[PDB]
Design an enzyme around this catalytic site. Structure first.
Site, mmCIF file in Angstrom:
data_model
loop_
_atom_site.group_PDB
_atom_site.id
_atom_site.type_symbol
_atom_site.label_atom_id
_atom_site.label_comp_id
_atom_site.label_asym_id
_atom_site.label_seq_id
_atom_site.Cartn_x
_atom_site.Cartn_y
_atom_site.Cartn_z
ATOM 1 N N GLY A 83 0.762 -1.293 -0.227
ATOM 2 C CA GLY A 83 0.118 0.138 0.057
ATOM 3 C C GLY A 83 0.711 1.269 0.049
ATOM 4 O O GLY A 83 2.235 1.183 0.116
ATOM 5 N N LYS A 106 4.892 12.174 -2.448
ATOM 6 C CA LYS A 106 5.746 11.199 -1.670
ATOM 7 C C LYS A 106 6.327 11.685 -0.350
ATOM 8 O O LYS A 106 6.666 13.010 -0.273
ATOM 9 C CB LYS A 106 7.054 10.793 -2.496
ATOM 10 C CG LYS A 106 7.314 9.377 -2.511
ATOM 11 C CD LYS A 106 8.212 9.033 -3.810
ATOM 12 C CE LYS A 106 7.811 7.320 -4.116
ATOM 13 N NZ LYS A 106 8.535 6.745 -4.911
ATOM 14 N N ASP A 118 8.600 5.206 8.580
ATOM 15 C CA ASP A 118 8.002 6.293 9.056
ATOM 16 C C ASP A 118 7.013 7.103 8.306
ATOM 17 O O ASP A 118 6.496 8.135 8.755
ATOM 18 C CB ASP A 118 9.019 7.342 9.776
ATOM 19 C CG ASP A 118 10.186 7.382 8.672
ATOM 20 O OD1 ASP A 118 9.936 7.614 7.458
ATOM 21 O OD2 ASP A 118 11.394 7.381 8.941
ATOM 22 N N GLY A 119 6.952 6.844 6.837
ATOM 23 C CA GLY A 119 6.229 7.441 5.993
ATOM 24 C C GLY A 119 6.718 8.745 5.469
ATOM 25 O O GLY A 119 6.278 9.615 4.940
ATOM 26 N N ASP A 244 4.210 -4.807 -7.262
ATOM 27 C CA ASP A 244 3.504 -3.630 -7.002
ATOM 28 C C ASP A 244 4.407 -2.527 -7.606
ATOM 29 O O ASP A 244 3.852 -1.173 -7.311
ATOM 30 C CB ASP A 244 3.692 -3.576 -5.375
ATOM 31 C CG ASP A 244 5.249 -3.635 -4.896
ATOM 32 O OD1 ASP A 244 5.344 -5.011 -5.048
ATOM 33 O OD2 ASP A 244 5.631 -3.056 -4.390
ATOM 34 N N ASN A 245 5.339 -2.532 -8.215
ATOM 35 C CA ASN A 245 6.021 -1.516 -9.080
ATOM 36 C C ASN A 245 5.819 -1.608 -10.546
ATOM 37 O O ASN A 245 6.137 -0.685 -11.190
ATOM 38 C CB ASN A 245 7.323 -1.560 -8.738
ATOM 39 C CG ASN A 245 7.834 -1.387 -7.324
ATOM 40 O OD1 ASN A 245 7.370 -0.338 -6.470
ATOM 41 N ND2 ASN A 245 8.598 -2.069 -6.873
ATOM 42 N N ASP A 254 7.829 4.155 -9.444
ATOM 43 C CA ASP A 254 8.715 3.790 -8.653
ATOM 44 C C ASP A 254 10.262 3.768 -8.929
ATOM 45 O O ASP A 254 10.844 2.913 -9.423
ATOM 46 C CB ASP A 254 8.481 2.766 -7.518
ATOM 47 C CG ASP A 254 7.124 3.048 -7.027
ATOM 48 O OD1 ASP A 254 6.810 4.192 -6.329
ATOM 49 O OD2 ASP A 254 6.387 2.177 -6.819
HETATM 50 MG MG LIG Z 1 7.130 1.194 -4.341
#
Ligand SMILES: [Mg+2]
Length: 465
Positions: A83, A106, A118-119, A244-245, A254
């Site tokens: 996610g 981002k 940590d985001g 996922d990329n 990405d």
């Molecule tokens: Mg990625």
């Protein structure tokens, strides 16, 4: 002047979490894409008065930020739920021509999907992504685009301590293969079908109004095959070709441990963590097919096993067609012979033996005059006998095209870049940036807008070793 819609939020519920960005301390803009903002209709007003939306400190009217959920295979192993962990979809901008562009920020702060992180994003990540995505765009390869970079005084702990940063990413969609995998393996095939209907409705609008799925998946295969073909011709190694990329739309998505080839090295591994060389440069054609095979598995509840395997089998044909046709331009073969791949393999094996510079070799080869043995490449090969023996036989083919030196040199010089985003050029922009000097970052960006124009500076030299 700026209009946003809530299409993902309202048409794909239970695929995201609503939340807001968390600002950084004293965020400031250090770069924005003036050309792209003009394409999108963004007033320069927005890039002044502080970090603003680019720092996650303001939302423009119509934005409803959300973090999407997805999953995917990482290095061939089901990694479970992933996610939006280091980014937030602020909203979807509607343009006057009717199209829609995601605004994905981002490093906008913590999300339910932030996992162990940590985001947050750091400055070196944001600059490398902005440089590479733009370089790819001006090479003609589909890609997400970078709109802005913000730095801050918020420290983030990685291998070092780095300044927290944020990058505004623009793309027509952030649909990944892992979006479909996420709901397949949760045994929710109706949510898989909703994603397909959504994607065809908004990005394949000409279909889907009777074999709509077969036609759609066939184009997804073609767009991924066409994407990998373009990566190979320029020497781009993605580094993290997880499912996922993989962009469903066929965009370079990405940018992390990527690398444009400096020395020609077919098995080049750009990701330090890719121990088995799974995402090696020469493995990218095969890995993409495997990723397309994961995606087809999720579409089996509503697309015939017959049509899926047929679309999958077109991958090899679409890849080699695109690869062969672009490599022919890079080689100046204005006509087609069954022969042309043997010359290219010869040249490639000599380059791999000598570790010749990929970009410079093809750029110098574009000064070629078919009737002369003279070439700036003679000084670049230690085994000058080998190159001379390849050159006249190669020039032997050029003379069979029956085409001017002027006509061939023009075509080659428009497809063989003089200039690629080499790792050391980015690192130099990064080092200057971390000390408050952004003039190098702006300069490199300017050069990467004209990659097919020859230069006199070190932007075209081999790395200093
Ligand atoms: Mg990625």
């Amino acid at each position: 002047t700026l209009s946003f819609i809530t299409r993902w939020r309202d048409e794909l519920p239970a695929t995201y979490t609503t939340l807001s960005p968390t600002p950084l301390n004293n965020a400031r803009l250090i770069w924005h894409n003036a050309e792209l903002a003009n394409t999108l209709g963004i007033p320069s007003s927005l890039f002044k008065n502080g970090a603003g939306v680019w720092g996650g400190e303001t939302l423009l009217p119509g934005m409803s930020p959300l973090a999407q959920v997805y999953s995917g295979h990482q290095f061939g192993v089901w990694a479970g739920q992933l996610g939006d962990g280091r980014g937030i979809l602020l909203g979807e901008q509607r343009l006057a021509d009717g199209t829609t562009m995601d605004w994905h920020l981002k490093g906008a702060g913590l999300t339910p999907y932030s996992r162990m992180g940590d985001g947050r994003a750091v400055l070196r990540s944001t600059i490398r992504e902005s440089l590479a995505s733009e370089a790819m765009h001006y090479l003609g390869i589909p890609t997400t685009r970078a709109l802005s970079i913000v730095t801050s005084d918020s420290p983030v702990y990685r291998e070092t301590v780095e300044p927290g940063a944020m990058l505004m990413r623009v793309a027509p969609s952030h649909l990944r293969f892992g979006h479909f995998e996420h709901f397949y393996y949760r045994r929710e095939p109706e949510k898989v079908r909703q994603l397909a209907d959504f994607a065809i409705r908004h990005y394949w609008s000409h279909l889907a109004d009777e074999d709509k799925y077969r036609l759609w998946f066939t184009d997804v295969v073609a767009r991924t095959a066409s994407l990998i073909a373009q990566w190979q011709t320029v020497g781009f190694a993605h580094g993290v070709m997880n499912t996922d990329n993989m962009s469903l739309l066929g965009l370079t998505l990405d940018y992390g441990p990527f690398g444009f080839l400096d020395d020609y090295e077919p098995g080049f591994i750009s990701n330090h963590s890719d121990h088995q060389g799974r995402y090696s440069f020469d493995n990218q054609p095969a890995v993409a097919l495997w990723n397309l095979q994961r995606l087809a598995q999720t579409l089996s509840p509503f697309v015939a096993v017959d049509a899926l395997n047929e679309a999958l089998d077109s991958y090899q044909q679409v890849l080699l067609t695109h690869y062969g046709q672009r490599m022919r331009q890079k080689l100046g073969f204005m006509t087609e012979q069954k022969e042309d791949n043997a010359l290219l393999n010869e040249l490639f094996s000599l380059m791999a033996r000598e570790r010749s510079d990929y970009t410079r070799t093809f750029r110098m080869l574009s000064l070629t005059e078919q009737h002369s043995a003279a070439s700036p490449l003679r000084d670049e090969f230690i085994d000058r006998a080998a190159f001379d023996d390849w050159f006249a036989r190669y020039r032997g083919r050029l003379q069979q095209d029956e085409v001017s030196d002027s006509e061939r040199q023009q075509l080659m010089q428009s497809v063989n870049p003089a200039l690629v985003l080499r790792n050391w050029l980015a690192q130099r922009a990064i080092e200057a940036a971390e000390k408050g000097d952004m003039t190098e970052l702006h300069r490199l960006h300017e050069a990467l807008r004209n990659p097919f124009s020859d230069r006199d500076d070190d932007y075209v030299s081999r790395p200093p070793d």
